[PDB]
Amino acid sequence: TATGVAITGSAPAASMDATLPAQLPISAASVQSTFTLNLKEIEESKEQVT
């Protein structure tokens, strides 16, 4: 703050700016996917498909 006081007066009260936190968590969830392929499927689709 910056207020008005007379020249033969006193000094005004205290004042100081402030900082704040933000904290944005990364600990909880995750994006995933699966395949589930057999072992006969990956053999008879190697001598057939073009």
Binding site: E41, S45, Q48, V49, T50
Partner: protein, 49 residues
Amino acid sequence: AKLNLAVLNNVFSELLTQEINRSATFLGLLSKYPERKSNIQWGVGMGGT
């Protein structure tokens, strides 16, 4: 949901099996001849004396 369930293709193999019976035995030993005429004529001799 298979990713190549409709692109896989059906291919045969070189295994033709001869099943029908088309043989020719008696034709195979008759000692063939090329007769270019209308009719074959020969002589048959009976008795009589």
